[PDB]
Amino acid sequence: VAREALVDLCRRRHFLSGTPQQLSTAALLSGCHARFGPLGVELRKNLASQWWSSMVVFREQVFAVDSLHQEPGSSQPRDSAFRLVSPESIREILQDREPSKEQLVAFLENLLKTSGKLRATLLHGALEHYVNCLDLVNRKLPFGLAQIGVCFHPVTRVGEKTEASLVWFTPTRTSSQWLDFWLRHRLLWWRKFAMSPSNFSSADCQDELGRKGSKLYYSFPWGKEPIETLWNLGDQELLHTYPGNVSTIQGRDGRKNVVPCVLSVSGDVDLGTLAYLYDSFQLAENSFARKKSLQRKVLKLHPCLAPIKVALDVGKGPTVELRQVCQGLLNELLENGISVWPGYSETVHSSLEQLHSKYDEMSVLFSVLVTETTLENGLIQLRSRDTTMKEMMHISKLRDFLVKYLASASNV
Amino acid sequence: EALVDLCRRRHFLSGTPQQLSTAALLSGCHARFGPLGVELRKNLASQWWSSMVVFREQVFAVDSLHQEPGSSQPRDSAFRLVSPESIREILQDREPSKEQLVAFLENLLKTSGKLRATLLHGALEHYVNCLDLVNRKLPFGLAQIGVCFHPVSVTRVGEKTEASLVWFTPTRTSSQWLDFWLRHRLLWWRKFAMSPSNFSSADCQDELGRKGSKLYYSFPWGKEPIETLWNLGDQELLHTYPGNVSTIQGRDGRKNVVPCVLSVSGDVDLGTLAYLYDSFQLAENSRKVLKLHPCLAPIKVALDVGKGPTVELRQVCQGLLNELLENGISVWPGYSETVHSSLEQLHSKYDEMSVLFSVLVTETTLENGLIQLRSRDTTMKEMMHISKLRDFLVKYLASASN
DNA sequence: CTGGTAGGCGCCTACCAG
DNA sequence: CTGGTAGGCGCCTACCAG
């Protein structure tokens, strides 16, 4: 019943898109449909950008990599990744000749042995770029290779998940210590944006070979779901990627030449976005909503994640002139990186109560009203998310206010 | 060509010598970019997003899958996605007859999903949803950046980063908008170019005579199309939403109309190759240099230490590096390199890496704070205090923004 | 095509409770 | 004062006869 309130709210406000059946929890978790509407896409982009700054920009010796969405096909009897086949090759064998049974078998066999397949993870792309980046860092360990990109997971249908991956190359001597560093770093990162950071947790695990790792979970209403995995792979995968002379893959550990240990850190950005939507869902606490049996709702997304930083509307006064003021203010805000909802450009009028209820459901951080008073003395009306506040401030100060507000929320 | 060699040595491009040929770079069959090229492409993409969705009126981001539903259309070359287990079953479960194999392949062509070749279908399938968002107010736009898959002349698969804007506008303002976007896109490509004349446009028409245009960059071997703009009309919009036309009508002022569909799509990957070529120039006075535009250059500033105590000198750089990162200024931490090259070797390397500013901290800085600043384009050593470096860099970037 | 009928959108003014 | 709203008006557009 409360799940039906949140998914419905996200659908109504375009955090999510889809039919009612595509919006069930099973469908959302499968990744078989494009889950996000325009506000959800912006939320996921904000989340991705936060991952990149904390995992790449502010980290030492972490470099970006790009790799293809498809990889050379294998002949392993249990490789279940979907294969890419040209329709024109199928049309040739069907329509251009009268194929025998043997030729159709031979065609289908060659499909299995040779055709490309969709990547399941981003790890292979990091391993394949390792020697190139080794030259960049003058062979010095440790360093990392980071990528955000879609991966494919069978579910007769194929789901798509946005994965954020860091592959960390370190001497075995320090691999366990680096694994603990990244685990704490990732757990702190998830928690910093949460209303209820206790709903993010970890649990140690071992893989089929006994290699050590840990997984990160978010406590959804139906149970815990893994959102991140960290593995200490050792140097197994690296030697298989580069068979032959080990001198080509040896890095510098101080003055020691060593084949590095490989740590793999991989998080699900799509599921993470779902988590923050659930985590942000609250009953409204402001006096207008609370003194009402309607039980208004608010999404309290963290300011760094909220897709819409500020909404702009007009109050009483000459509409064309007021819209002109809003337009100049919007352009100033956009130029300084502040996303704006241009409510002023609407031609149907709604009450302030209706307007502020909608903006709370959209997680708008601040609502700004431009009125005939603004035309006289430049004062605008500022209301914070889920409050009854009407703070008067000069329109020339709004930009600096919001810039410092977001900076304050960013390094807290 | 020494340019691709330079981009490989400095890790703009990746790959073996064979996949660094012109035909291999244009095909997109390998991941072409090293770490510096990935950042350059990312800067290009952000600049696209800034000028196409952030500052544009009623342009919204759209999300769509890489997979699209399959159809028996005969003129569709897009790759199909096939379960390896279905193939094993038809081959291994029992002895298959010729007819069952034909039936298997036919059913494959008719029913299997396909990898997108363009971002257009994803924008069309989200049209009705976003129409509710804008309260049916036309015009509005749906925008996405994402990888698409193209058949390449065994047959391989090419991957290209496409930046797409699909513009819905009343069929009466179609040409006025198409012309606006064309000028806006050509100006966009030229803002960052050293030789803006090497970007150009040319008109084109499709199989059924629909108006459009293509943008080109003059590579040394000839022109290559980097962006296409199409006035599609409304055939795909009606085919995407078959049935009642009331559900897809937008509001042209007070008029309810079925919108015209414009498609604007540029090749981000070919775009970064274009700018690498455009930036390649000879160094002035006293070697090569890449003079990428300041908004595009991957490395804004490089930090190094001079003669003196290697201990406390590397300490000041980290305090400065973290300050620059906090204000969105990317930094090459040259002071951690233990090889210790000369300044000539260092500046020649930074020039090849397109580093905008080179900063040197020394014991003169330890006793005062006067760092040594060097510009990529105009190579000379200007002195300035360290507490004004960030502010100088942010204002220099803002100047180059517009 | 010209131009008459009628719906209703967008903006304004004024009045009222708090 | 502030915000909600009832009532008025100028004009665009959709239809249709002619």
CSV table of N, CA and C in Angstrom, one decimal, chain A residues 11 14 17-18 31-36 38-39 41 44-45 52 57-58 61 63-70 76-88 90-91 93-94 98-99 101 104-105 107-109 111-112 118 129 132 135-136 138 140 150 152 158-160 334-335 341-342 346-347, chain B residues 8-9 11 14-15 29-31 35-36 38 41-42 49 54-55 58 60-67 73-74 76-85 87-88 90-91 95-96 98 101-102 104-106 108-109 115 126 129 132-133 135 137 147 149 155 157 159 322 325-326 332-333 336-338:
chain,number,residue,atom,x,y,z
A,11,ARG,N,5.9,7.8,-10.7
A,11,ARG,CA,5.3,7.8,-12.0
A,11,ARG,C,4.6,9.1,-12.4
A,14,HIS,N,7.3,11.7,-12.9
A,14,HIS,CA,8.3,11.4,-14.0
A,14,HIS,C,9.7,11.1,-13.4
A,17,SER,N,9.1,5.9,-15.4
A,17,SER,CA,8.1,5.7,-16.5
A,17,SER,C,7.8,4.2,-16.6
A,18,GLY,N,6.6,4.0,-17.2
A,18,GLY,CA,6.2,2.6,-17.5
A,18,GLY,C,4.8,2.3,-17.2
A,31,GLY,N,15.4,-4.9,-14.8
A,31,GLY,CA,16.1,-4.1,-15.7
A,31,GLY,C,15.7,-4.3,-17.2
A,32,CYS,N,14.6,-4.9,-17.4
A,32,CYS,CA,14.1,-5.2,-18.8
A,32,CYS,C,13.4,-4.0,-19.5
A,33,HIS,N,13.2,-2.9,-18.8
A,33,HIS,CA,12.6,-1.8,-19.4
A,33,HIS,C,13.3,-0.5,-18.9
A,34,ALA,N,13.2,0.5,-19.7
A,34,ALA,CA,13.8,1.8,-19.4
A,34,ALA,C,13.0,2.4,-18.2
A,35,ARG,N,13.5,2.3,-17.0
A,35,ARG,CA,12.7,2.6,-15.8
A,35,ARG,C,12.5,4.1,-15.5
A,36,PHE,N,13.3,5.0,-16.0
A,36,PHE,CA,13.3,6.3,-15.5
A,36,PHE,C,12.7,7.4,-16.5
A,38,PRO,N,12.2,11.7,-17.1
A,38,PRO,CA,13.2,12.8,-17.1
A,38,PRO,C,13.7,13.2,-15.8
A,39,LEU,N,12.9,13.3,-14.7
A,39,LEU,CA,13.5,13.6,-13.4
A,39,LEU,C,14.3,12.4,-12.8
A,41,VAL,N,16.1,10.3,-14.7
A,41,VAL,CA,17.4,10.3,-15.4
A,41,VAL,C,18.3,11.4,-14.9
A,44,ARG,N,19.7,10.0,-11.6
A,44,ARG,CA,20.7,9.0,-11.8
A,44,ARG,C,22.0,9.7,-12.3
A,45,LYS,N,21.9,10.7,-13.2
A,45,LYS,CA,23.1,11.4,-13.7
A,45,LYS,C,23.7,12.1,-12.5
A,52,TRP,N,31.7,9.6,-9.7
A,52,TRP,CA,32.9,9.9,-10.5
A,52,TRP,C,33.8,10.8,-9.7
A,57,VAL,N,37.9,11.7,-9.6
A,57,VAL,CA,38.5,13.1,-9.6
A,57,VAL,C,39.3,13.3,-8.3
A,58,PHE,N,38.7,12.9,-7.2
A,58,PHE,CA,39.4,13.1,-5.9
A,58,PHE,C,40.2,12.0,-5.4
A,61,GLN,N,45.6,8.5,-8.7
A,61,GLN,CA,46.0,7.5,-9.7
A,61,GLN,C,44.8,6.6,-10.1
A,63,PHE,N,42.2,6.4,-13.3
A,63,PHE,CA,42.1,6.9,-14.7
A,63,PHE,C,40.8,6.3,-15.3
A,64,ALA,N,40.2,7.0,-16.2
A,64,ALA,CA,39.1,6.5,-16.9
A,64,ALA,C,39.5,5.5,-18.0
A,65,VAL,N,38.6,4.6,-18.3
A,65,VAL,CA,38.7,3.7,-19.4
A,65,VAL,C,37.4,3.6,-20.2
A,66,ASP,N,37.5,3.3,-21.5
A,66,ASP,CA,36.4,3.1,-22.3
A,66,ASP,C,36.5,1.7,-23.0
A,67,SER,N,35.4,0.9,-23.0
A,67,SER,CA,35.5,-0.4,-23.6
A,67,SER,C,34.2,-0.6,-24.4
A,68,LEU,N,34.2,-1.6,-25.2
A,68,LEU,CA,33.0,-1.9,-26.0
A,68,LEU,C,31.9,-2.6,-25.2
A,69,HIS,N,30.7,-2.5,-25.7
A,69,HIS,CA,29.6,-3.2,-25.1
A,69,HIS,C,29.6,-4.6,-25.4
A,70,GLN,N,30.3,-5.1,-26.4
A,70,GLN,CA,30.3,-6.5,-26.8
A,70,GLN,C,31.8,-7.0,-26.8
A,76,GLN,N,32.2,-21.7,-24.7
A,76,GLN,CA,31.9,-22.4,-23.4
A,76,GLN,C,30.5,-22.8,-23.3
A,77,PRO,N,30.2,-24.1,-22.9
A,77,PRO,CA,28.8,-24.6,-23.1
A,77,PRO,C,27.8,-23.9,-22.1
A,78,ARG,N,28.3,-23.2,-21.2
A,78,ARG,CA,27.3,-22.5,-20.3
A,78,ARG,C,27.4,-21.0,-20.4
A,79,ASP,N,28.2,-20.4,-21.3
A,79,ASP,CA,28.2,-19.0,-21.6
A,79,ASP,C,26.8,-18.6,-22.1
A,80,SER,N,26.0,-17.9,-21.3
A,80,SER,CA,24.6,-17.6,-21.6
A,80,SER,C,24.4,-16.2,-22.1
A,81,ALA,N,25.5,-15.4,-22.3
A,81,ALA,CA,25.4,-14.1,-22.8
A,81,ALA,C,24.8,-14.1,-24.2
A,82,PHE,N,23.9,-13.2,-24.5
A,82,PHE,CA,23.3,-13.2,-25.8
A,82,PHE,C,24.3,-12.8,-26.9
A,83,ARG,N,24.1,-13.4,-28.1
A,83,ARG,CA,25.0,-13.2,-29.2
A,83,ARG,C,24.5,-12.2,-30.2
A,84,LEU,N,25.4,-11.5,-30.9
A,84,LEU,CA,25.0,-10.6,-31.9
A,84,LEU,C,25.2,-11.2,-33.3
A,85,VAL,N,24.1,-11.3,-34.0
A,85,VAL,CA,24.1,-11.9,-35.4
A,85,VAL,C,23.5,-10.9,-36.4
A,86,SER,N,24.2,-10.8,-37.5
A,86,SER,CA,23.7,-9.9,-38.6
A,86,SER,C,22.4,-10.5,-39.2
A,87,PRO,N,21.3,-9.8,-39.3
A,87,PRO,CA,20.2,-10.3,-40.0
A,87,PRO,C,20.4,-10.6,-41.5
A,88,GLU,N,21.4,-9.9,-42.1
A,88,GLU,CA,21.6,-10.1,-43.5
A,88,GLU,C,22.3,-11.4,-43.8
A,90,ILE,N,21.6,-14.1,-42.0
A,90,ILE,CA,20.5,-15.0,-42.0
A,90,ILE,C,19.7,-15.0,-43.2
A,91,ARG,N,19.4,-13.8,-43.8
A,91,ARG,CA,18.6,-13.7,-45.0
A,91,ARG,C,19.4,-14.3,-46.2
A,93,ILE,N,21.5,-17.0,-46.1
A,93,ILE,CA,21.4,-18.5,-46.1
A,93,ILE,C,19.9,-18.9,-46.3
A,94,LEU,N,19.0,-18.1,-45.9
A,94,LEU,CA,17.6,-18.5,-46.1
A,94,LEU,C,17.1,-18.2,-47.6
A,98,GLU,N,19.4,-22.5,-51.6
A,98,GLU,CA,18.5,-23.5,-51.1
A,98,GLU,C,19.3,-24.3,-50.1
A,99,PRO,N,19.6,-23.9,-48.9
A,99,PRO,CA,20.5,-24.5,-48.0
A,99,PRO,C,20.2,-26.0,-47.7
A,101,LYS,N,20.5,-29.2,-45.0
A,101,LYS,CA,20.5,-29.4,-43.5
A,101,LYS,C,21.9,-29.2,-43.0
A,104,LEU,N,22.9,-25.5,-42.9
A,104,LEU,CA,22.3,-24.8,-41.8
A,104,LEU,C,22.9,-25.1,-40.4
A,105,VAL,N,23.2,-26.4,-40.2
A,105,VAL,CA,23.9,-26.8,-39.0
A,105,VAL,C,25.3,-26.0,-38.9
A,107,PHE,N,26.2,-23.3,-40.4
A,107,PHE,CA,25.9,-21.9,-40.1
A,107,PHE,C,25.7,-21.6,-38.7
A,108,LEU,N,24.8,-22.4,-38.1
A,108,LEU,CA,24.4,-22.2,-36.6
A,108,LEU,C,25.6,-22.5,-35.7
A,109,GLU,N,26.4,-23.5,-36.1
A,109,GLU,CA,27.6,-23.8,-35.3
A,109,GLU,C,28.6,-22.6,-35.3
A,111,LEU,N,27.9,-19.6,-35.9
A,111,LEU,CA,27.3,-18.5,-35.0
A,111,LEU,C,27.8,-18.6,-33.6
A,112,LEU,N,27.7,-19.8,-33.0
A,112,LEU,CA,28.1,-20.0,-31.6
A,112,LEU,C,29.6,-19.8,-31.4
A,118,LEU,N,27.3,-9.9,-25.7
A,118,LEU,CA,27.1,-8.7,-24.8
A,118,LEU,C,27.9,-8.8,-23.5
A,129,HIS,N,42.8,-2.9,-20.8
A,129,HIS,CA,43.5,-1.6,-20.9
A,129,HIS,C,44.6,-1.5,-19.9
A,132,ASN,N,48.3,-0.6,-21.2
A,132,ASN,CA,48.3,0.7,-21.8
A,132,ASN,C,48.4,1.7,-20.6
A,135,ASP,N,51.9,2.1,-18.9
A,135,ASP,CA,52.9,3.0,-19.5
A,135,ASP,C,52.6,4.4,-19.1
A,136,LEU,N,51.3,4.8,-18.9
A,136,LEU,CA,50.9,6.1,-18.6
A,136,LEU,C,51.5,6.5,-17.2
A,138,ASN,N,54.1,5.3,-15.7
A,138,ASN,CA,55.5,4.9,-15.7
A,138,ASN,C,55.6,3.7,-14.8
A,140,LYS,N,54.2,2.5,-12.3
A,140,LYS,CA,54.1,2.6,-10.8
A,140,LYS,C,52.7,2.2,-10.3
A,150,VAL,N,26.6,0.6,-19.3
A,150,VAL,CA,25.6,-0.4,-19.2
A,150,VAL,C,26.2,-1.8,-19.4
A,152,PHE,N,24.8,-6.2,-19.4
A,152,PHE,CA,23.6,-7.0,-19.8
A,152,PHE,C,23.6,-8.3,-19.0
A,158,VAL,N,16.7,-9.9,-21.9
A,158,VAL,CA,18.0,-9.4,-21.4
A,158,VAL,C,17.8,-8.1,-20.7
A,159,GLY,N,18.2,-8.0,-19.4
A,159,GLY,CA,18.1,-6.8,-18.7
A,159,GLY,C,19.4,-6.0,-18.8
A,160,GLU,N,19.2,-4.7,-18.5
A,160,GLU,CA,20.3,-3.7,-18.7
A,160,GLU,C,20.5,-3.0,-17.4
A,334,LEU,N,21.0,29.0,-14.5
A,334,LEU,CA,21.5,28.0,-15.4
A,334,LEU,C,22.9,28.2,-15.7
A,335,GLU,N,23.4,29.4,-16.0
A,335,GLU,CA,24.8,29.7,-16.3
A,335,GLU,C,25.7,29.3,-15.1
A,341,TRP,N,13.2,24.8,-12.4
A,341,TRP,CA,11.9,24.5,-13.0
A,341,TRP,C,11.2,25.8,-13.4
A,342,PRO,N,10.9,26.0,-14.7
A,342,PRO,CA,10.3,27.3,-15.1
A,342,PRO,C,8.8,27.2,-15.0
A,346,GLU,N,4.0,28.6,-17.3
A,346,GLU,CA,2.7,28.0,-17.4
A,346,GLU,C,1.6,29.1,-17.4
A,347,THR,N,0.6,28.8,-18.1
A,347,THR,CA,-0.5,29.7,-18.3
A,347,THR,C,-1.8,29.4,-17.5
B,8,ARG,N,48.6,8.3,-29.6
B,8,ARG,CA,48.9,7.0,-29.0
B,8,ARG,C,49.9,7.1,-27.9
B,9,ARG,N,51.0,7.8,-28.2
B,9,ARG,CA,52.1,8.0,-27.2
B,9,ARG,C,51.6,8.7,-25.9
B,11,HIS,N,48.4,8.9,-25.0
B,11,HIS,CA,47.2,8.2,-24.5
B,11,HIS,C,45.9,8.9,-24.7
B,14,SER,N,44.0,4.7,-28.1
B,14,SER,CA,44.4,3.4,-27.7
B,14,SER,C,44.4,2.5,-28.9
B,15,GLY,N,45.2,1.4,-28.8
B,15,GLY,CA,45.2,0.4,-29.9
B,15,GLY,C,46.5,0.0,-30.5
B,29,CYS,N,35.2,-0.2,-34.6
B,29,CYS,CA,35.2,-1.6,-34.2
B,29,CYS,C,36.0,-1.9,-32.9
B,30,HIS,N,36.9,-1.0,-32.5
B,30,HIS,CA,37.6,-1.1,-31.2
B,30,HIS,C,37.3,0.1,-30.4
B,31,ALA,N,37.5,0.0,-29.1
B,31,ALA,CA,37.5,1.2,-28.2
B,31,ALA,C,38.7,2.0,-28.5
B,35,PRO,N,43.0,7.1,-21.8
B,35,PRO,CA,42.4,7.9,-20.7
B,35,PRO,C,42.3,9.4,-21.1
B,36,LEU,N,43.3,10.0,-21.8
B,36,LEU,CA,43.1,11.4,-22.1
B,36,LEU,C,42.0,11.6,-23.1
B,38,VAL,N,39.3,9.7,-23.5
B,38,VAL,CA,38.1,9.5,-22.8
B,38,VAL,C,37.6,10.8,-22.1
B,41,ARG,N,36.6,13.4,-24.8
B,41,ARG,CA,35.3,13.0,-25.3
B,41,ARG,C,34.2,13.4,-24.2
B,42,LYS,N,34.6,13.2,-23.0
B,42,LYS,CA,33.6,13.6,-21.9
B,42,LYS,C,33.4,15.1,-21.8
B,49,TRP,N,25.8,18.7,-23.9
B,49,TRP,CA,24.6,18.7,-22.9
B,49,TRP,C,24.3,20.1,-22.4
B,54,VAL,N,20.7,21.9,-21.1
B,54,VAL,CA,20.7,22.8,-19.9
B,54,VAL,C,20.2,24.2,-20.2
B,55,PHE,N,20.7,24.8,-21.3
B,55,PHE,CA,20.3,26.2,-21.7
B,55,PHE,C,19.2,26.3,-22.7
B,58,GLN,N,12.8,23.8,-22.8
B,58,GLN,CA,11.9,22.7,-22.9
B,58,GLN,C,12.6,21.5,-23.6
B,60,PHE,N,14.4,18.0,-22.5
B,60,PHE,CA,14.4,17.1,-21.3
B,60,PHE,C,15.2,15.8,-21.7
B,61,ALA,N,15.9,15.3,-20.7
B,61,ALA,CA,16.7,14.0,-20.9
B,61,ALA,C,15.7,12.9,-21.0
B,62,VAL,N,16.1,11.9,-21.8
B,62,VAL,CA,15.3,10.7,-22.0
B,62,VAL,C,16.2,9.5,-21.8
B,63,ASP,N,15.7,8.4,-21.3
B,63,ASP,CA,16.4,7.2,-21.0
B,63,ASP,C,15.8,6.1,-21.9
B,64,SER,N,16.6,5.3,-22.6
B,64,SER,CA,16.1,4.2,-23.4
B,64,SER,C,17.1,3.1,-23.4
B,65,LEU,N,16.6,1.9,-23.6
B,65,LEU,CA,17.5,0.7,-23.6
B,65,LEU,C,18.3,0.6,-24.9
B,66,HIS,N,19.4,-0.1,-24.8
B,66,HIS,CA,20.2,-0.4,-26.0
B,66,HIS,C,19.5,-1.4,-26.9
B,67,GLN,N,18.6,-2.2,-26.3
B,67,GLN,CA,17.8,-3.2,-27.0
B,67,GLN,C,16.5,-2.6,-27.5
B,73,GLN,N,11.0,-6.4,-40.8
B,73,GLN,CA,11.3,-5.4,-41.9
B,73,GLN,C,12.5,-5.8,-42.7
B,74,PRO,N,12.5,-5.8,-44.0
B,74,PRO,CA,13.6,-6.4,-44.8
B,74,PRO,C,14.8,-5.4,-45.0
B,76,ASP,N,16.2,-3.6,-42.7
B,76,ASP,CA,16.8,-3.4,-41.4
B,76,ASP,C,18.0,-4.2,-41.1
B,77,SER,N,19.2,-3.6,-41.2
B,77,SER,CA,20.4,-4.3,-41.0
B,77,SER,C,20.9,-4.4,-39.6
B,78,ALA,N,20.2,-3.8,-38.6
B,78,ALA,CA,20.7,-3.7,-37.3
B,78,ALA,C,20.8,-5.1,-36.7
B,79,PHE,N,21.9,-5.3,-35.9
B,79,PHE,CA,22.2,-6.6,-35.3
B,79,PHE,C,21.1,-7.2,-34.5
B,80,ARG,N,20.9,-8.5,-34.5
B,80,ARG,CA,19.9,-9.2,-33.7
B,80,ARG,C,20.6,-9.8,-32.5
B,81,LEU,N,19.9,-10.0,-31.4
B,81,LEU,CA,20.4,-10.6,-30.2
B,81,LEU,C,19.7,-11.9,-30.0
B,82,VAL,N,20.5,-13.0,-29.8
B,82,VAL,CA,20.1,-14.3,-29.9
B,82,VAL,C,20.7,-15.1,-28.7
B,83,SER,N,19.8,-15.9,-28.1
B,83,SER,CA,20.2,-16.7,-26.9
B,83,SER,C,21.1,-17.8,-27.4
B,84,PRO,N,22.3,-18.0,-26.9
B,84,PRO,CA,23.1,-19.2,-27.2
B,84,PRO,C,22.4,-20.5,-26.8
B,85,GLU,N,21.6,-20.5,-25.8
B,85,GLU,CA,20.9,-21.7,-25.5
B,85,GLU,C,19.9,-22.1,-26.5
B,87,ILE,N,20.2,-21.7,-29.7
B,87,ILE,CA,20.9,-22.3,-30.8
B,87,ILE,C,21.4,-23.7,-30.4
B,88,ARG,N,21.8,-23.9,-29.1
B,88,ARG,CA,22.2,-25.2,-28.7
B,88,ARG,C,21.1,-26.2,-28.7
B,90,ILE,N,18.3,-26.2,-30.6
B,90,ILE,CA,17.9,-26.6,-32.0
B,90,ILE,C,19.0,-27.6,-32.6
B,91,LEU,N,20.3,-27.4,-32.2
B,91,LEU,CA,21.3,-28.2,-32.7
B,91,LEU,C,21.5,-29.5,-31.9
B,95,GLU,N,17.9,-34.6,-33.5
B,95,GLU,CA,18.4,-34.4,-34.8
B,95,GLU,C,17.5,-33.5,-35.6
B,96,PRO,N,18.0,-32.3,-35.9
B,96,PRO,CA,17.1,-31.3,-36.6
B,96,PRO,C,16.9,-31.6,-38.1
B,98,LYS,N,15.9,-30.1,-41.9
B,98,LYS,CA,16.1,-28.9,-42.7
B,98,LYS,C,15.0,-27.9,-42.4
B,101,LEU,N,15.2,-26.2,-39.0
B,101,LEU,CA,16.2,-25.2,-38.9
B,101,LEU,C,15.8,-23.9,-39.7
B,102,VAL,N,15.1,-24.1,-40.8
B,102,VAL,CA,14.6,-22.9,-41.5
B,102,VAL,C,13.6,-22.2,-40.6
B,104,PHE,N,13.5,-22.2,-37.4
B,104,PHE,CA,14.2,-21.6,-36.4
B,104,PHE,C,14.8,-20.2,-36.8
B,105,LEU,N,15.4,-20.2,-38.0
B,105,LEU,CA,16.0,-19.0,-38.5
B,105,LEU,C,15.0,-17.9,-38.8
B,106,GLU,N,13.9,-18.3,-39.5
B,106,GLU,CA,12.8,-17.4,-39.8
B,106,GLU,C,12.3,-16.8,-38.5
B,108,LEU,N,13.7,-16.4,-35.8
B,108,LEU,CA,14.8,-15.5,-35.3
B,108,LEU,C,14.6,-14.1,-35.9
B,109,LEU,N,14.6,-14.1,-37.2
B,109,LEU,CA,14.4,-12.8,-37.9
B,109,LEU,C,13.2,-12.0,-37.5
B,115,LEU,N,19.8,-4.5,-31.6
B,115,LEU,CA,20.5,-3.4,-31.0
B,115,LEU,C,20.3,-2.1,-31.8
B,126,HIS,N,9.1,7.7,-25.7
B,126,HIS,CA,8.9,8.5,-24.5
B,126,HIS,C,8.1,9.7,-24.7
B,129,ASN,N,4.8,10.3,-22.7
B,129,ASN,CA,5.1,10.5,-21.3
B,129,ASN,C,5.5,11.9,-21.0
B,132,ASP,N,2.9,14.9,-21.1
B,132,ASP,CA,2.2,15.2,-19.9
B,132,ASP,C,3.1,16.1,-19.0
B,133,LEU,N,4.4,15.9,-19.0
B,133,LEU,CA,5.3,16.7,-18.2
B,133,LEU,C,5.2,18.2,-18.5
B,135,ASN,N,2.9,19.7,-19.9
B,135,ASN,CA,1.5,20.1,-20.0
B,135,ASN,C,1.1,20.3,-21.4
B,137,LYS,N,2.6,21.4,-23.9
B,137,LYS,CA,3.0,22.7,-24.6
B,137,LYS,C,4.2,22.3,-25.6
B,147,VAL,N,25.6,5.0,-26.8
B,147,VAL,CA,26.3,4.2,-27.8
B,147,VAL,C,25.2,3.6,-28.7
B,149,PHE,N,24.9,1.0,-32.5
B,149,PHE,CA,25.6,-0.1,-33.1
B,149,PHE,C,25.3,-0.1,-34.6
B,155,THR,N,31.4,-10.4,-40.5
B,155,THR,CA,31.0,-9.0,-40.5
B,155,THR,C,31.0,-8.5,-39.1
B,157,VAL,N,31.0,-5.4,-35.8
B,157,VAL,CA,30.1,-4.5,-35.2
B,157,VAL,C,30.8,-3.2,-34.8
B,159,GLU,N,30.7,0.5,-32.9
B,159,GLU,CA,30.1,1.2,-31.8
B,159,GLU,C,30.4,2.7,-31.9
B,322,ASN,N,44.3,19.8,-4.3
B,322,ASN,CA,43.0,19.6,-3.8
B,322,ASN,C,42.1,20.8,-3.9
B,325,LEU,N,40.9,21.0,-7.6
B,325,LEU,CA,39.9,20.0,-7.8
B,325,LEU,C,38.6,20.4,-7.2
B,326,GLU,N,38.6,21.0,-6.1
B,326,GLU,CA,37.3,21.4,-5.4
B,326,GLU,C,36.6,22.5,-6.2
B,332,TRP,N,47.2,17.5,-13.5
B,332,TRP,CA,48.2,16.5,-13.7
B,332,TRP,C,49.2,16.5,-12.6
B,333,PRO,N,49.3,15.6,-11.7
B,333,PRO,CA,50.2,15.6,-10.6
B,333,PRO,C,51.6,15.2,-10.9
B,336,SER,N,54.7,13.9,-8.4
B,336,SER,CA,54.9,12.5,-7.8
B,336,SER,C,55.8,11.7,-8.7
B,337,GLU,N,56.1,12.1,-10.0
B,337,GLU,CA,57.0,11.4,-10.8
B,337,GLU,C,58.4,11.5,-10.3
B,338,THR,N,59.1,10.3,-10.1
B,338,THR,CA,60.4,10.3,-9.5
B,338,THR,C,61.5,10.3,-10.6
